[PDB]
Amino acid sequence: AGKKVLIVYAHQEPKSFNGSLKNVAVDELSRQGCTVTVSDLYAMNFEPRATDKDITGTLSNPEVFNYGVETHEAYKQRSLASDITDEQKKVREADLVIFQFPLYWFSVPAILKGWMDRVLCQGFAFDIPGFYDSGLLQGKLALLSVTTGGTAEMYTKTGVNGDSRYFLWPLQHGTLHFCGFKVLAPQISFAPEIASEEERKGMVAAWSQRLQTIWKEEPIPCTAHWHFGQ
Amino acid sequence: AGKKVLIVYAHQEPKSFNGSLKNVAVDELSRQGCTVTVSDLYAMNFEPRATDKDITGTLSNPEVFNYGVETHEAYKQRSLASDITDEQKKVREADLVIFQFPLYWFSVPAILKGWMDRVLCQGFAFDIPGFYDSGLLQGKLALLSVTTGGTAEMYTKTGVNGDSRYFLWPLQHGTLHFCGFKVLAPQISFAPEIASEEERKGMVAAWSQRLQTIWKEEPIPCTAHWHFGQ
Ligand SMILES: Cc1cc2nc3c(=O)[nH]c(=O)nc-3n(C[C@H](O)[C@H](O)[C@H](O)COP(=O)(O)OP(=O)(O)OC[C@H]3O[C@@H](n4cnc5c(N)ncnc54)[C@H](O)[C@@H]3O)c2cc1C
Ligand SMILES: Cc1cc2nc3c(=O)[nH]c(=O)nc-3n(C[C@H](O)[C@H](O)[C@H](O)COP(=O)(O)OP(=O)(O)OC[C@H]3O[C@@H](n4cnc5c(N)ncnc54)[C@H](O)[C@@H]3O)c2cc1C
Ligand SMILES: CC(=O)NCC[C@H]1C(=O)Nc2ccc(NC(C)=O)cc21
Ligand SMILES: CC(=O)NCC[C@H]1C(=O)Nc2ccc(NC(C)=O)cc21
Ligand SMILES: [Zn+2]
Ligand SMILES: [Zn+2]
């Protein structure tokens, strides 16, 4: 309290392990008195593709379509599609954005990649200047809560997949940091499908317990050193 | 020589710099007598979202939808949606797959992320076990041709963005190598928007020039060391 949290959630199945994580997050943040909002991407049939439909009215160059320029102009002229502006409003109000998603190809599922591509437009999320430490969403926290098919050992530096931190870089540094977010340590729930039962409960309660003190956390140093170095 | 190439292409605007890199690739590979096919994702309105619409028969578990399990099973039963199977046939016949795209958040645009998510399914592109060097697309080549907003200098170890290779890890290693491809060195065309008209033409010609001898190239060692040094 009086903190506001947006959960951007990307899983097709409410009964899934990702669903339980999103649900404990709602329950636990709600119990603490926080304002909570959930963008359930699949239930919304969220549009992932960046297209000239994302701008309403007529385009600032109808002959040669440049998505970055058109959306930056449209943001400034209040002319973006209402699905984008609805999400921007929720992000602008949010003190903390939590992303809840199964890892797809060492990244976010496409439907969430399209939320980042379409919602985080120039002039809203970043500008010249105002990227990295001075990006436009500075003051806000962000947190990736990711579930994997691969095991924790597969995700170490000499394991087949490399360090978990290797795949966080495009998301934590190239996206969240770039926009000005302070990045909280990722929550990574490894390999729920091949875990018991009891290990899954353990992972759910680790998350529930972490959420109890989420407002006391220090952000990570979102650096190349943090992701790759010793 | 008698080789087959698939260009998976992700830009909205035919007149764009990405469109020019795609067309020069078509022209040049066509001139050498290669068989060439282009999946122009935006023109196809390619579906990026992994949903239960991608399976047409009875689900293994209709109570709890698991997209990876159901697609794996649907692949073996030949009950995947036809847009997925159409791309799989293109990949199956290809000797080389070029991905042509602008960098979006240190990654591929969501439309192209959806293509990886949906087309490279278990059974087709890899199995457990049957990945990295045992992946199912072994013996095929892939190449990322990427355009950026940021300059070469912004993409170095000591630049704001970190080395360009850092952002290639989820795509080259986590996705292509994981499916068994050998990965040719990426073509990165930095900052065409700020480049002079002359430097822009040099970058297009450098790509066309490289493609003349693409069949003589050896792939990279797609390892943590290659991406991260250290
Ligand atoms: C296109 C695609 C690409 C992928 N790429 C990668 C990749 O790059 N790297 C990688 O490692 N993995 C990858 N995966 C695998 C994927 O990340 C995992 O399949 C996913 O993270 C599993 O999370 P889930 O929520 O779907 O698990 P679920 O299958 O829903 O959950 C596992 C089990 O937990 C149960 N459960 C639900 N709630 C609870 C509860 N509260 N307490 C205890 N148990 C509960 C479920 O019912 C289920 O039995 C990929 C998968 C796909 C489809
Ligand atoms: C959602 C989003 C996220 C992004 N994220 C990133 C990021 O993470 N990192 C990053 O660095 N950048 C990022 N960008 C910037 C993006 O990668 C660049 O805008 C894109 O790579 C530029 O390529 P283009 O084909 O669209 O260039 P264009 O604007 O189409 O090309 C530049 C100029 O070249 C001209 N041209 C076309 N053909 C030729 C030809 N044959 N010869 C000479 N000139 C020609 C065009 O007419 C144009 O004037 C992002 C952009 C968006 C919209
Ligand atoms: C042991 C086990 O089940 N491992 C999951 C493998 C996992 C991975 O490490 N990379 C990757 C890429 C795509 C998938 N896709 C699936 C599970 O459908 C899964 C993985
Ligand atoms: C000048 C420049 O574009 N710098 C590179 C940084 C890069 C990034 O990480 N995210 C992002 C988002 C948009 C852009 N540019 C545009 C046109 O949107 C560039 C970047
Ligand atoms: Zn950072
Ligand atoms: Zn590799």
Short mmCIF file of N, CA, C and O in Angstrom, two decimals, chain A residues 5-96:
data_model
loop_
_atom_site.label_atom_id
_atom_site.label_comp_id
_atom_site.label_asym_id
_atom_site.label_seq_id
_atom_site.Cartn_x
_atom_site.Cartn_y
_atom_site.Cartn_z
N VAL A 5 0.37 -2.33 -8.72
CA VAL A 5 1.03 -3.42 -9.42
C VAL A 5 0.27 -3.82 -10.71
O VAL A 5 -1.00 -4.03 -10.70
N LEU A 6 1.01 -3.90 -11.81
CA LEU A 6 0.44 -4.50 -13.05
C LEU A 6 1.12 -5.83 -13.27
O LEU A 6 2.35 -5.86 -13.33
N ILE A 7 0.33 -6.90 -13.41
CA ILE A 7 0.87 -8.18 -13.82
C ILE A 7 0.55 -8.38 -15.31
O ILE A 7 -0.62 -8.39 -15.68
N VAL A 8 1.59 -8.48 -16.14
CA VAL A 8 1.36 -8.86 -17.55
C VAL A 8 1.59 -10.35 -17.66
O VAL A 8 2.72 -10.87 -17.49
N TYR A 9 0.50 -11.06 -17.94
CA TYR A 9 0.52 -12.52 -17.81
C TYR A 9 0.32 -13.13 -19.19
O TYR A 9 -0.57 -12.70 -19.95
N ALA A 10 1.13 -14.14 -19.51
CA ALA A 10 1.11 -14.79 -20.85
C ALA A 10 1.13 -16.30 -20.70
O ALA A 10 2.19 -16.99 -20.87
N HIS A 11 -0.04 -16.85 -20.44
CA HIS A 11 -0.18 -18.30 -20.51
C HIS A 11 -1.66 -18.57 -20.91
O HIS A 11 -2.55 -17.86 -20.46
N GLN A 12 -1.88 -19.62 -21.71
CA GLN A 12 -3.18 -19.96 -22.25
C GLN A 12 -4.07 -20.66 -21.24
O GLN A 12 -5.28 -20.74 -21.44
N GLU A 13 -3.45 -21.25 -20.20
CA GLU A 13 -4.16 -22.16 -19.30
C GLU A 13 -4.23 -21.62 -17.84
O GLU A 13 -3.19 -21.54 -17.18
N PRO A 14 -5.45 -21.38 -17.32
CA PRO A 14 -5.60 -20.86 -15.95
C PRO A 14 -5.10 -21.87 -14.90
O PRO A 14 -4.63 -21.46 -13.82
N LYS A 15 -5.21 -23.16 -15.19
CA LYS A 15 -4.81 -24.20 -14.24
C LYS A 15 -3.29 -24.47 -14.29
O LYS A 15 -2.80 -25.35 -13.61
N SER A 16 -2.56 -23.70 -15.09
CA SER A 16 -1.13 -24.00 -15.35
C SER A 16 -0.27 -23.59 -14.16
O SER A 16 -0.73 -22.92 -13.26
N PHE A 17 1.00 -23.92 -14.19
CA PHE A 17 1.89 -23.47 -13.11
C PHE A 17 2.03 -21.93 -13.19
O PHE A 17 2.04 -21.26 -12.18
N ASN A 18 2.05 -21.40 -14.40
CA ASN A 18 2.10 -19.92 -14.59
C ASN A 18 0.83 -19.26 -14.05
O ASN A 18 0.90 -18.20 -13.41
N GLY A 19 -0.32 -19.91 -14.29
CA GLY A 19 -1.57 -19.43 -13.71
C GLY A 19 -1.53 -19.37 -12.20
O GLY A 19 -2.01 -18.44 -11.64
N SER A 20 -1.00 -20.40 -11.54
CA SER A 20 -0.93 -20.41 -10.06
C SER A 20 0.01 -19.32 -9.57
O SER A 20 -0.27 -18.72 -8.55
N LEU A 21 1.06 -19.00 -10.34
CA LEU A 21 1.98 -17.97 -9.91
C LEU A 21 1.38 -16.58 -10.02
O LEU A 21 1.58 -15.73 -9.12
N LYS A 22 0.64 -16.38 -11.08
CA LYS A 22 -0.07 -15.10 -11.30
C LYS A 22 -1.14 -14.98 -10.21
O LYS A 22 -1.26 -13.93 -9.56
N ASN A 23 -1.89 -16.07 -9.96
CA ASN A 23 -2.90 -16.06 -8.89
C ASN A 23 -2.36 -15.84 -7.48
O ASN A 23 -2.95 -15.12 -6.68
N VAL A 24 -1.23 -16.46 -7.12
CA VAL A 24 -0.67 -16.13 -5.80
C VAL A 24 -0.18 -14.70 -5.70
O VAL A 24 -0.27 -14.08 -4.63
N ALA A 25 0.27 -14.15 -6.82
CA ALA A 25 0.70 -12.79 -6.85
C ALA A 25 -0.45 -11.82 -6.63
O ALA A 25 -0.37 -10.93 -5.81
N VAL A 26 -1.52 -11.95 -7.44
CA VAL A 26 -2.77 -11.26 -7.12
C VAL A 26 -3.16 -11.47 -5.65
O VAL A 26 -3.42 -10.53 -4.96
N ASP A 27 -3.28 -12.71 -5.16
CA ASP A 27 -3.77 -12.87 -3.76
C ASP A 27 -2.91 -12.18 -2.72
O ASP A 27 -3.42 -11.55 -1.81
N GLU A 28 -1.59 -12.35 -2.87
CA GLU A 28 -0.69 -11.88 -1.87
C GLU A 28 -0.54 -10.33 -1.89
O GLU A 28 -0.55 -9.70 -0.82
N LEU A 29 -0.42 -9.76 -3.08
CA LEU A 29 -0.38 -8.28 -3.26
C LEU A 29 -1.73 -7.63 -2.88
O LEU A 29 -1.77 -6.59 -2.25
N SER A 30 -2.83 -8.29 -3.22
CA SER A 30 -4.13 -7.79 -2.79
C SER A 30 -4.32 -7.78 -1.24
O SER A 30 -4.85 -6.80 -0.61
N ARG A 31 -3.90 -8.87 -0.62
CA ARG A 31 -3.89 -8.98 0.85
C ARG A 31 -3.09 -7.89 1.53
O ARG A 31 -3.43 -7.46 2.62
N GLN A 32 -2.02 -7.45 0.89
CA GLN A 32 -1.20 -6.43 1.50
C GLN A 32 -1.82 -5.06 1.32
O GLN A 32 -1.36 -4.08 1.89
N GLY A 33 -2.88 -4.98 0.54
CA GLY A 33 -3.52 -3.70 0.36
C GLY A 33 -3.12 -3.03 -0.97
O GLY A 33 -3.58 -1.91 -1.22
N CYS A 34 -2.26 -3.66 -1.81
CA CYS A 34 -1.88 -3.05 -3.10
C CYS A 34 -3.03 -3.00 -4.13
O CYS A 34 -3.94 -3.80 -4.10
N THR A 35 -2.98 -2.03 -5.01
CA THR A 35 -3.85 -2.02 -6.22
C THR A 35 -3.25 -2.97 -7.25
O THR A 35 -2.07 -2.91 -7.56
N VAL A 36 -4.04 -3.90 -7.74
CA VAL A 36 -3.49 -4.88 -8.63
C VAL A 36 -4.34 -4.91 -9.89
O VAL A 36 -5.56 -4.91 -9.81
N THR A 37 -3.69 -5.06 -11.02
CA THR A 37 -4.35 -5.14 -12.32
C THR A 37 -3.62 -6.24 -13.05
O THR A 37 -2.38 -6.39 -12.90
N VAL A 38 -4.35 -7.06 -13.82
CA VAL A 38 -3.70 -8.15 -14.59
C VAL A 38 -4.08 -7.99 -16.05
O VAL A 38 -5.30 -7.83 -16.38
N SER A 39 -3.06 -7.94 -16.94
CA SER A 39 -3.34 -7.98 -18.39
C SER A 39 -3.13 -9.43 -18.80
O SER A 39 -1.98 -9.88 -18.91
N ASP A 40 -4.23 -10.17 -18.95
CA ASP A 40 -4.19 -11.58 -19.35
C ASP A 40 -4.15 -11.61 -20.91
O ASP A 40 -5.21 -11.57 -21.60
N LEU A 41 -2.92 -11.60 -21.46
CA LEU A 41 -2.73 -11.43 -22.89
C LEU A 41 -3.53 -12.39 -23.75
O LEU A 41 -4.17 -11.95 -24.69
N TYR A 42 -3.51 -13.70 -23.45
CA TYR A 42 -4.21 -14.63 -24.31
C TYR A 42 -5.72 -14.49 -24.21
O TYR A 42 -6.44 -14.65 -25.20
N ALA A 43 -6.21 -14.19 -23.00
CA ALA A 43 -7.67 -14.07 -22.81
C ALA A 43 -8.21 -12.84 -23.55
O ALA A 43 -9.36 -12.82 -24.03
N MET A 44 -7.36 -11.84 -23.62
CA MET A 44 -7.64 -10.62 -24.36
C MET A 44 -7.44 -10.78 -25.86
O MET A 44 -7.75 -9.82 -26.59
N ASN A 45 -6.89 -11.94 -26.30
CA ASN A 45 -6.48 -12.14 -27.69
C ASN A 45 -5.61 -10.94 -28.14
O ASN A 45 -5.75 -10.37 -29.26
N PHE A 46 -4.72 -10.54 -27.24
CA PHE A 46 -3.79 -9.47 -27.51
C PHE A 46 -3.06 -9.51 -28.87
O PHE A 46 -2.47 -10.50 -29.23
N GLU A 47 -3.11 -8.40 -29.62
CA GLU A 47 -2.50 -8.32 -30.95
C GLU A 47 -0.99 -8.15 -30.81
O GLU A 47 -0.55 -7.12 -30.26
N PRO A 48 -0.18 -9.13 -31.28
CA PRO A 48 1.27 -9.05 -31.16
C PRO A 48 1.92 -8.33 -32.35
O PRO A 48 3.08 -7.92 -32.23
N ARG A 49 1.22 -8.18 -33.48
CA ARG A 49 1.93 -7.75 -34.66
C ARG A 49 1.99 -6.21 -34.70
O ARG A 49 0.97 -5.52 -34.53
N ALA A 50 3.18 -5.69 -35.04
CA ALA A 50 3.34 -4.21 -35.20
C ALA A 50 2.92 -3.83 -36.60
O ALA A 50 3.69 -4.06 -37.56
N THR A 51 1.78 -3.14 -36.74
CA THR A 51 1.29 -2.88 -38.08
C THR A 51 0.71 -1.51 -38.08
O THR A 51 0.44 -0.93 -37.00
N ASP A 52 0.44 -1.03 -39.30
CA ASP A 52 -0.16 0.28 -39.48
C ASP A 52 -1.59 0.37 -38.92
O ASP A 52 -2.12 1.44 -38.86
N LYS A 53 -2.17 -0.74 -38.42
CA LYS A 53 -3.46 -0.64 -37.69
C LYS A 53 -3.26 -0.01 -36.32
O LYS A 53 -4.24 0.42 -35.71
N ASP A 54 -2.00 0.04 -35.84
CA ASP A 54 -1.69 0.58 -34.49
C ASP A 54 -1.83 2.10 -34.42
O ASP A 54 -1.75 2.70 -33.31
N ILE A 55 -2.01 2.71 -35.59
CA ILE A 55 -2.23 4.15 -35.66
C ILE A 55 -3.65 4.38 -36.26
O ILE A 55 -3.99 3.82 -37.29
N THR A 56 -4.42 5.26 -35.61
CA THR A 56 -5.79 5.65 -36.04
C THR A 56 -5.71 6.99 -36.76
O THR A 56 -4.76 7.78 -36.54
N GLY A 57 -6.71 7.28 -37.59
CA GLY A 57 -6.69 8.49 -38.42
C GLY A 57 -5.71 8.24 -39.56
O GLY A 57 -5.43 7.09 -39.91
N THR A 58 -5.15 9.29 -40.11
CA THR A 58 -4.26 9.08 -41.25
C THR A 58 -2.76 9.15 -40.82
O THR A 58 -2.41 9.73 -39.79
N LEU A 59 -1.90 8.52 -41.61
CA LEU A 59 -0.52 8.28 -41.20
C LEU A 59 0.38 9.47 -41.57
O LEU A 59 0.13 10.13 -42.57
N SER A 60 1.42 9.76 -40.79
CA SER A 60 2.27 10.91 -41.16
C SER A 60 3.13 10.67 -42.39
O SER A 60 3.75 11.60 -42.90
N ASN A 61 3.17 9.42 -42.88
CA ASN A 61 3.63 9.12 -44.27
C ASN A 61 2.94 7.89 -44.86
O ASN A 61 3.45 6.76 -44.74
N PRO A 62 1.77 8.10 -45.50
CA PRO A 62 0.97 7.03 -46.13
C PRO A 62 1.67 6.27 -47.29
O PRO A 62 1.11 5.30 -47.81
N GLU A 63 2.86 6.71 -47.71
CA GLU A 63 3.55 6.12 -48.87
C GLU A 63 4.63 5.08 -48.51
O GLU A 63 4.89 4.14 -49.26
N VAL A 64 5.28 5.27 -47.37
CA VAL A 64 6.41 4.45 -46.96
C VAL A 64 6.25 4.31 -45.45
O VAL A 64 6.53 5.25 -44.72
N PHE A 65 5.74 3.18 -45.00
CA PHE A 65 5.41 2.99 -43.59
C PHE A 65 6.60 2.65 -42.67
O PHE A 65 7.24 1.58 -42.77
N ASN A 66 6.88 3.55 -41.74
CA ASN A 66 7.95 3.36 -40.76
C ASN A 66 7.35 3.26 -39.35
O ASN A 66 6.92 4.27 -38.76
N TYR A 67 7.30 2.05 -38.79
CA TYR A 67 6.54 1.81 -37.60
C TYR A 67 7.01 2.70 -36.42
O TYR A 67 6.20 3.25 -35.72
N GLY A 68 8.32 2.82 -36.20
CA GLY A 68 8.86 3.61 -35.10
C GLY A 68 8.48 5.07 -35.20
O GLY A 68 8.10 5.68 -34.20
N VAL A 69 8.60 5.64 -36.40
CA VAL A 69 8.27 7.05 -36.58
C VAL A 69 6.77 7.29 -36.43
O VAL A 69 6.33 8.21 -35.73
N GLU A 70 5.98 6.46 -37.10
CA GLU A 70 4.54 6.59 -37.06
C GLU A 70 4.00 6.46 -35.62
O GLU A 70 3.18 7.25 -35.22
N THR A 71 4.51 5.50 -34.83
CA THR A 71 4.02 5.35 -33.49
C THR A 71 4.47 6.44 -32.54
O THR A 71 3.69 6.78 -31.64
N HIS A 72 5.70 6.96 -32.72
CA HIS A 72 6.22 8.07 -31.91
C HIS A 72 5.35 9.31 -32.18
O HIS A 72 4.90 9.98 -31.22
N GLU A 73 5.09 9.60 -33.46
CA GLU A 73 4.13 10.72 -33.82
C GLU A 73 2.72 10.47 -33.25
O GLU A 73 2.17 11.33 -32.60
N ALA A 74 2.19 9.25 -33.43
CA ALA A 74 0.86 8.90 -32.93
C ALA A 74 0.73 9.01 -31.37
O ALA A 74 -0.31 9.40 -30.87
N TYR A 75 1.74 8.54 -30.63
CA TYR A 75 1.79 8.79 -29.19
C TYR A 75 1.61 10.31 -28.86
O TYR A 75 0.77 10.68 -28.02
N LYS A 76 2.40 11.16 -29.53
CA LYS A 76 2.39 12.58 -29.27
C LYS A 76 1.04 13.22 -29.67
O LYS A 76 0.62 14.14 -29.01
N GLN A 77 0.41 12.71 -30.74
CA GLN A 77 -0.87 13.20 -31.23
C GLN A 77 -2.08 12.44 -30.69
O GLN A 77 -3.18 12.64 -31.20
N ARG A 78 -1.90 11.60 -29.66
CA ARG A 78 -2.99 10.80 -29.04
C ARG A 78 -3.80 9.96 -30.07
O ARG A 78 -5.03 9.87 -30.00
N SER A 79 -3.08 9.32 -30.99
CA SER A 79 -3.68 8.66 -32.13
C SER A 79 -3.28 7.18 -32.22
O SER A 79 -3.31 6.61 -33.31
N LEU A 80 -2.89 6.56 -31.10
CA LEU A 80 -2.59 5.14 -31.10
C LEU A 80 -3.87 4.31 -30.95
O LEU A 80 -4.85 4.73 -30.32
N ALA A 81 -3.85 3.09 -31.48
CA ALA A 81 -4.95 2.14 -31.23
C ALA A 81 -5.25 2.04 -29.72
O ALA A 81 -4.34 2.10 -28.88
N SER A 82 -6.52 1.84 -29.40
CA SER A 82 -6.98 1.84 -28.00
C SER A 82 -6.46 0.55 -27.24
O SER A 82 -6.29 0.58 -26.04
N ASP A 83 -6.13 -0.53 -27.91
CA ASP A 83 -5.55 -1.62 -27.15
C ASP A 83 -4.14 -1.24 -26.58
O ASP A 83 -3.80 -1.57 -25.44
N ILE A 84 -3.36 -0.48 -27.34
CA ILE A 84 -2.07 0.02 -26.88
C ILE A 84 -2.23 1.07 -25.77
O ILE A 84 -1.53 1.03 -24.75
N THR A 85 -3.11 2.03 -25.99
CA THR A 85 -3.28 3.12 -25.00
C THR A 85 -3.85 2.60 -23.64
O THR A 85 -3.45 3.08 -22.53
N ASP A 86 -4.74 1.62 -23.71
CA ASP A 86 -5.23 0.91 -22.51
C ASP A 86 -4.05 0.30 -21.75
O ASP A 86 -3.97 0.44 -20.53
N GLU A 87 -3.13 -0.36 -22.44
CA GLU A 87 -1.99 -0.95 -21.72
C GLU A 87 -1.05 0.17 -21.19
O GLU A 87 -0.48 0.06 -20.10
N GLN A 88 -0.85 1.22 -22.00
CA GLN A 88 0.05 2.29 -21.55
C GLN A 88 -0.48 2.93 -20.27
O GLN A 88 0.28 3.26 -19.36
N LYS A 89 -1.80 3.16 -20.22
CA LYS A 89 -2.42 3.70 -18.99
C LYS A 89 -2.12 2.81 -17.74
O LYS A 89 -1.78 3.31 -16.66
N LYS A 90 -2.28 1.50 -17.90
CA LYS A 90 -2.02 0.58 -16.80
C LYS A 90 -0.53 0.64 -16.38
O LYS A 90 -0.22 0.60 -15.16
N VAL A 91 0.40 0.70 -17.36
CA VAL A 91 1.82 0.84 -17.04
C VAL A 91 2.11 2.21 -16.38
O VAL A 91 2.82 2.29 -15.40
N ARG A 92 1.55 3.29 -16.92
CA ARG A 92 1.80 4.61 -16.34
C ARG A 92 1.36 4.66 -14.86
O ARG A 92 2.04 5.30 -14.03
N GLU A 93 0.27 3.95 -14.53
CA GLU A 93 -0.23 3.98 -13.12
C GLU A 93 0.60 3.07 -12.18
O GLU A 93 0.71 3.34 -10.96
N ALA A 94 1.23 2.06 -12.77
CA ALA A 94 1.85 0.97 -12.04
C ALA A 94 3.17 1.46 -11.37
O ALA A 94 3.97 2.20 -12.01
N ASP A 95 3.39 1.05 -10.13
CA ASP A 95 4.69 1.26 -9.46
C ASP A 95 5.60 0.10 -9.74
O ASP A 95 6.81 0.25 -9.68
N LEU A 96 5.01 -1.07 -10.05
CA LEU A 96 5.73 -2.33 -10.28
C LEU A 96 5.03 -3.06 -11.42
O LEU A 96 3.80 -3.25 -11.41
#
